[PDB]
Design a protein around this nucleic acid. Structure first.
Ligand SMILES: [K+]
Ligand SMILES: [K+]
Ligand SMILES: [Mg+2]
Ligand SMILES: [Mg+2]
Ligand SMILES: [Mg+2]
Lengths: 113, 158, 148, 59, 98, 54, 61, 216
RNA sequence: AAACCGGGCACUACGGUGAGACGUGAAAACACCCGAUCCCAUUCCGACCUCGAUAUGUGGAAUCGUCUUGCGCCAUAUGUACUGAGAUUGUUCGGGAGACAUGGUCCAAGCCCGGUGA
RNA sequence: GUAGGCUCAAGCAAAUCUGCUCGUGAGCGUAAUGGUAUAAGCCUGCCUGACUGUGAGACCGACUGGUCGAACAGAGACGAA
C-alpha cells in the first residue's frame, strides 16, 4: 500500500497552538515546543546544548531523556506556557524515552492537552 | 569463543576478501538464519511430530492456520544447530543443493539415526518423513554461496 | 467472431436502448492501421452483421477467383467494424405495451470516416474492384482509401 | 526469547575423529551431559560390474 | 407477456447544501452523502451517516489534495480562532499584567 | 408468517420493576441473559436479569 | 583490502588483466577447524586402521 | 559534418515548391470557415524555443489548390518528412515579403469524409535544430527474395519509423533491401541504414517486416 | 558577525514518484557495524521495533549530493468534435474540449540547536 | 464500546514463509451503489453508552410524519493521558 500523507489533528473548538515534538538519535535527545500559527520554535531542550552536554554523563538513554524533559518543563513554566499538546511520530509509542520525556514534563507541571 | 563463528571471522573472511573482487569489507557474505519446515505428508495431531521438531531445534515452533509448521533460528542457537549438523555431516555423504543465496538440506530420519545424541529416544523420530532445512546467507552470487559452504564443510578425513 | 457471423458470445445486459446514430465523425482524420488499401464510410448509420459478412464474403470470393495457387491466400483482409448492439422486435398481432420484445439480431454503429475494411497483399486494381463489389452490399456510402 | 515457552538446554561434549574436543548445547533429554566420540563410519558401498563378475568365475 | 421490472425507490435528496463561500451558523448541514465523498475539515463535524455539519459561524471553504484527489470542507470562523480557556485564564492574565 | 425471534424483558433486580425490552433468537440457547445496566428509579447501576415477555 | 587494491594497480597490463580474475576454486576439505583441544597424536591413524580392518574382506549376503 | 552522405537519397527538385501565405488575424471556427469558403487553408508557423507563451507564432493562410496538389503528388507521409520554403507576404500579388523561412510541415489535417485539407502546421527548422521526424519506409528487392520466390507472403509490420533528426539531413525515405531474406526471418529497426547522426527513438529490437511461410 | 555545513520543524507536485551512472562521511552531525541482562518486540525467532554499548571502522542497506531519463504535473498553441442565443427548413454571433504538437521540472523561502569560521 | 498492536488481494523469484512490482482490484453478515489503509478491515485485554431526562440549529415535505446534531444534568465503561 501507499502510505498517505499525515495531517495535523482537526480543529474542533479551540486553537491549542503549542505542540510538543520529540526526537532521539544514537548520541543525543531533543525535544521542541512549536508555536503552530507562526511555525516557530517557542521552546527547546536537548542534550546537545552547550550548557547541558557536559553537565550529564550519558546523553542518550532514558535517564538523559527524563532530565531533558524536566529541564524543558521548567523552561516552559518560566516562559509561561501552562499546557502543551503532544505530537507522536510514525514509530513512537508511549514507551521508553518518549514515556520518560512525557512523564518528566507532566511532573514538572505542564498540563497536557 | 565458539568454534563456528570464530572460524568464520578468523579464517573465511580474510580469504573471501582475497579471492574475490570487493569494494568494501562490509560486502563480504555472512550467515543470517536457518529455517526448518517439516516434510509435506504428516499427521498434524500426534505428539511425536511436535516433539521430533522441538528436540533438534531447541525452540518452540509456530503452527499457523494447523496446516503449516515452522521454526526460524537466528544467532547462537543457529550456530549451535549448524555446528551439530556439520559434525554429523562427516559420517556420510548427504546431498545439498546450492541456490542463488541459500543452501537446501534434507533432514531425513537417516540423519537422526547417525546423530549420536539421538541414538536414544529414537521412537520419537521413528515414523517421521523428515524435515527441510534452509540455510540463508547474505550472498549476491550462487558461486559466493558455493564457496562459503565449501569453506564451512570441513573434516579431517581424505 | 463466431466463425462467419460476428456477434458477442455474451453481453452484460440482454436489451439495450435504441440510442442515436445519425451523427458523429472522426474529429482527427482517419488513417489505415494494418493494410495498404481499405474501405471507409462517408456517411453515418447502421450496418447489420449479415451485411458485414456478405461484404467480407464478396471480397474474399473475388480474391479467390482473381488469384489462385500460392497467392490465393496472399490477400489479407481485416474487418475493423464489429456488430455488438442487439436489436429487438415484437411479432405480428400484438398490442403495444407488455414489456420489451425478444432480440432478433445485431447491428453496428458506423461513424463518418470509420474504416470498415482493410486489404493487403493484392494488386491495386483487385483491391479497387473488390471494394466496388463489397460496397453494393452495404446501405451506406463508402470510399476506397489508399495508404500514403 | 519469551519466558516459559522454550525447552531447557544442556551442555554436551563432542570428540572429532582426530581427538579434538568441542562443547555444544542441546535440548535437555538426559540427566547429565555426556561425551560422544565420532568414528569413520562412512559406510561406502560398491557393486561389481558384469565383466568383473564374468572374470571372477571364468578365469 | 409479463414484465418483472416495475420497482424503484423514493428519492433521497443528497448533494451539497452549502456551496463555497456560503455563510453558515452552527448546526447547519453542509453535505448530505453516502460515504465520505468529502472529508471533514476544521470546525466541521460528521454524523453517523457521514453527514457534514458546521460547528462555528463562518464561511464554507473547500480544499482538494493535489496528489490523491481527496476533498475536505473547512469553515473559516467569523471572528478568527479562539484560544483555549487555560491560556485565557493564565497567559492572558499575565499578558495584561505585562 | 412464522417469526424467528422473540422479545424478552431484562428486569431490574432492585425490585423497582424497571425493565428493558430486548430481543433474542428462537433457534435455541440455555444461558439466560444478564447485564449491569442503569436503573433510573434508584439512580445506580444494578443487575438486570432476563425474564419472559408478558 | 586497501593495500591489496593498491598492489593490483602497480602491475603491467596483461599481468594485471590476469590478476583481476576472481578465484572460484573451492576451499580444501582437509584443512582443519579450530577448537578447544589439539588433536591426539595416536588417534586419527588408529581410527583409520580400525575402519580399514572392518572394511577388510567382504560381507556375506 | 551536416551533409547527406553518398549512397543516400536526397529530396527531389521536382517537388521543391515555395509555399505562399498571407496573414490571418484571428482564431476560431468562424474565421476558419470564412477562409475555407474563400479558398484558403488556415495555418500557423511557430518555433521550438518557448513552448509556453505561444512560441513566436504567426497565424497565416495558404492556398488550398497548392496544398492539395502537394499532398496528392507526394503522399501523406512523404509530405511530412520533407522541408519546405515558406514565404509570407502581406497580400497575394504584393511584394511586401514579411517572412521567408525554411520550415517543416509538422501536421496536416484532412477531413475524414471528404479529405479536403482543414489545417496545416509549420515549425521553423533552420540549420542546427533538432526535430522528431516520422520517416516512411520503401521496400525494394521483392523480386529477388528467395522466400517470396518460394510462395511465401509478406507481413509489413511497420510502415513509418520515428527518428530524432537534425534539420539538414532529414531523409525523405528509407530504402529497405529484401534481396537476401528467405522464409522465417524478420528485419528489426536496428538494421536501417541511416546517417550516423540520427538517433532512433524506438528500441532497436522492434520487428519491421517478417517473411512467413505459406499454407502448404 | 556574516556566510557555509549537519539535525529537527515548517513551505511544496515546475517543489511528486521510480530507474541508471558518478561521487560524498568535514577534528562535527546522521546511520550502520556489536549484544539481548532489565523495559519492549515475535500467535517461533533481536527479521521489525525496543533497550544498552561504540577516542573511531564503513557509507556495502538506508541518508546526502551531481547529471541522464520513464510516468506524472505545469504552461501554451493550431484545427476538429460538441454546445448557448437565433430559424434564410439553422448562410449569424459567442463558448470550446479529448487525442495530437511545443517547452519546462523554475524563482522565492522562515524558526531553533550544533560545528567550521570566529 | 474502548485501549493497544497489525495491513490485505493479485504477479514475479525461490516452487507454505521470506523479498521485490502494483494499487482498491481483499474484507466490511445480508442486493446494488458510494466509502474506507496507524481504517470503517484483522487480533488481544477489559466491559455493556444495545443508558435515563432534555436539546441551539438545520435537511426532506400536502398533511400525518422522518433524518443529522453541538451542548446541559445524573449514573457508568475503557484509557497513563
Ligand atoms: K473488542
Ligand atoms: K454528559
Ligand atoms: Mg476562440
Ligand atoms: Mg488540451
Ligand atoms: Mg488503534
Amino acid at each position: 500500500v501507499i502510505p498517505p500523507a499525515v495531517r495535523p489533528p482537526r480543529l474542533f473548538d479551540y486553537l491549542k497552538p503549542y505542540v510538543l515534538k520529540m526526537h532521539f538519535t544514537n548520541k543525543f535527545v531533543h525535544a521542541q515546543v512549536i508555536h503552530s500559527p507562526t511555525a516557530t520554535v517557542a521552546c527547546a531542550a536537548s542534550s546537545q546544548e552547550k550548557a547541558l552536554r557536559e553537565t550529564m554523563g550519558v546523553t542518550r538513554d532514558v535517564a538523559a531523556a527524563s532530565k531533558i524533559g524536566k529541564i524543558l518543563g521548567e523552561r516552559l513554566l518560566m516562559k509561561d506556557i501552562p499546557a502543551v499538546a503532544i505530537h507522536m511520530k510514525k514509530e513512537q509509542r508511549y514507551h521508553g524515552k518518549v514515556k520518560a520525556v512525557i512523564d518528566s514534563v507532566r511532573e514538572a507541571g505542564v498540563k497536557l492537552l | 569463543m565458539f568454534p563456528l563463528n570464530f572460524h568464520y571471522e578468523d579464517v573465511l573472511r580474510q580469504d573471501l576478501l582475497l579471492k574475490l573482487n570487493y569494494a568494501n569489507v562490509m560486502e563480504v557474505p555472512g550467515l543470517c538464519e536457518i529455517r526448518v519446515v517439516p516434510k509435506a505428508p504428516y499427521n498434524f495431531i500426534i505428539k511425536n511430530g511436535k516433539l521430533a521438531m522441538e528436540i533438534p531445534c531447541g525452540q518452540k515452533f509456530i503452527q499457523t492456520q494447523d496446516l503449516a509448521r515452522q521454526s526460524t533460528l537466528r544467532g547462537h542457537g543457529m550456530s549451535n544447530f549448524l555446528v551439530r549438523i556439520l559434525t554429523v555431516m562427516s559420517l556420510l555423504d548427504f546431498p545439498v543443493e546450492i541456490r542463488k543465496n541459500s543452501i537446501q538440506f534434507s533432514m531425513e530420519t537417516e540423519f537422526c539415526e547417525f546423530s549420536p545424541e539421538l541414538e536414544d529416544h529414537f521412537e520419537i523420530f521413528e515414523h517421521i518423513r523428515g524435515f527441510n532445512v534452509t540455510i540463508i546467507t547474505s550472498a549476491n552470487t550462487q558461486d559466493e554461496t558455493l564457496l562459503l559452504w565449501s569453506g564451512f564443510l570441513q573434516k579431517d578425513e581424505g | 467472431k463466431k466463425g462467419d457471423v460476428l456477434y458477442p458470445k455474451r453481453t452484460k445486459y440482454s436489451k439495450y436502448r435504441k440510442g442515436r446514430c445519425s451523427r458523429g465523425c472522426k474529429p482527427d482524420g482517419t488513417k489505415l492501421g494494418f493494410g495498404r488499401y481499405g474501405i471507409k464510410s462517408c456517411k453515418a448509420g447502421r450496418l447489420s452483421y449479415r451485411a458485414i459478412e456478405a461484404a467480407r464474403r464478396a471480397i474474399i470470393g473475388h480474391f479467390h477467383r482473381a488469384m489462385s495457387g500460392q497467392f490465393r491466400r496472399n490477400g489479407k483482409i481485416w474487418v475493423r467494424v464489429f456488430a455488438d448492439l442487439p436489436i429487438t422486435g415484437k411479432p405480428t398481432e400484438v398490442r403495444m405495451g407488455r414489456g420489451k420484445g425478444n432480440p432478433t439480431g445485431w447491428i453496428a454503429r458506423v461513424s463518418t470516416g470509420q474504416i470498415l475494411f482493410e486489404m493487403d497483399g493484392v494488386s491495386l486494381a483487385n483491391a479497387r474492384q473488390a471494394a466496388t463489389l463489397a460496397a453494393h452490399k452495404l446501405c451506406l456510402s463508402t470510399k476506397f482509401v489508399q495508404w500514403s | 526469547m519469551k519466558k516459559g515457552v522454550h525447552p531447557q538446554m544442556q551442555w554436551i561434549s563432542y570428540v572429532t575423529q582426530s581427538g579434538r574436543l568441542m562443547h555444544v548445547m542441546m535440548t535437555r533429554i538426559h540427566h547429565v551431559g555426556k561425551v560422544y566420540h565420532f568414528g569413520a563410519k562412512r559406510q561406502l558401498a560398491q557393486s561389481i560390474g558384469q565383466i568383473a563378475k564374468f572374470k571372477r568365475r571364468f578365469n | 407477456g409479463s414484465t418483472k421490472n416495475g420497482r424503484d425507490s423514493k428519492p433521497k435528496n443528497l448533494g451539497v447544501k452549502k456551496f463555497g463561500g456560503e455563510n453558515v451558523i452552527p448546526g447547519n448541514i453542509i453535505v448530505r452523502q453516502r460515504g465520505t465523498r468529502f472529508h471533514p475539515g476544521d470546525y466541521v463535524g460528521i454524523g453517523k451517516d457521514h453527514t457534514l455539519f458546521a460547528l462555528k459561524e463562518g464561511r464554507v471553504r473547500f480544499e482538494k489534495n493535489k496528489i490523491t484527489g481527496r476533498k475536505w470542507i473547512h469553515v473559516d470562523p467569523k471572528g478568527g480562532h479562539v484560544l483555549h480557556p487555560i491560556y485565557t485564564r493564565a497567559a492572558a492574565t499575565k499578558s495584561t499584567q505585562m | 408468517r412464522k417469526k424467528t425471534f422473540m422479545f424478552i424483558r431484562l428486569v431490574s433486580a432492585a425490585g423497582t420493576g424497571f425493565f428493558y425490552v430486548k430481543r433474542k433468537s428462537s433457534k435455541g440457547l440455555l444461558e439466560k441473559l444478564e447485564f449491569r445496566k442503569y436503573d433510573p428509579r434508584v439512580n445506580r447501576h444494578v443487575l438486570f436479569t432476563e425474564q419472559k415477555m408478558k | 583490502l586497501n593495500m591489496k587494491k593498491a598492489a593490483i594497480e602497480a602491475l603491467p597490463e596483461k599481468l594485471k588483466m590476469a590478476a583481476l580474475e576472481p578465484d572460484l576454486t573451492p576451499f580444501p576439505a582437509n584443512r582443519g577447524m579450530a577448537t578447544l583441544t589439539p588433536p591426539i597424536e595416536g588417534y586419527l591413524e588408529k581410527v583409520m586402521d580400525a575402519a580399514k580392518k572392518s572394511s577388510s574382506k567382504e560381507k556375506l549376503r | 559534418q551536416l551533409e547527406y552522405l553518398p549512397g543516400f537519397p536526397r529530396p527531389d527538385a521536382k517537388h521543391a515548391e515555395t509555399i505562399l501565405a498571407v496573414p490571418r488575424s484571428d482564431s476560431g471556427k468562424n474565421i476558419s470557415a470564412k477562409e475555407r469558403k474563400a479558398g484558403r487553408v488556415p495555418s500557423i508557423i511557430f518555433e521550438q524555443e518557448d513552448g509556453q507563451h505561444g512560441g513566436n507564432k504567426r497565424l497565416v493562410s495558404v492556398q488550398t489548390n497548392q496544398i492539395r496538389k502537394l499532398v496528392t503528388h507526394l503522399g501523406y507521409s512523404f509530405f511530412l518528412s520533407r522541408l519546405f520554403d515558406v514565404e509570407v507576404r502581406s497580400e497575394i500579388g504584393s511584394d511586401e515579403v514579411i517572412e521567408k523561412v525554411r520550415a517543416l510541415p509538422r501536421s496536416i489535417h484532412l477531413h475524414s469524409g471528404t479529405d479536403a485539407p482543414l489545417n496545416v502546421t509549420f515549425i521553423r527548422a533552420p540549420p542546427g535544430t533538432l526535430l522528431k521526424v516520422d520517416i516512411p519506409l520503401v521496400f525494394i528487392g521483392d523480386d529477388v527474395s528467395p522466400g517470396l520466390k518460394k510462395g511465401a507472403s509478406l507481413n509489413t509490420i511497420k510502415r513509418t519509423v520515428k527518428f530524432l533528426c537534425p534539420a539538414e539531413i532529414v531523409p525523405p525515405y528509407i530504402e529497405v533491401d529484401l534481396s537476401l531474406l528467405d522464409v522465417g526471418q524478420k528485419l528489426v529497426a536496428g538494421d536501417l541504414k541511416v546517417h550516423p547522426a540520427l538517433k532512433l527513438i524506438r528500441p532497436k529490437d522492434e520487428p519491421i517486416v517478417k517473411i512467413a511461410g505459406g499454407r502448404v
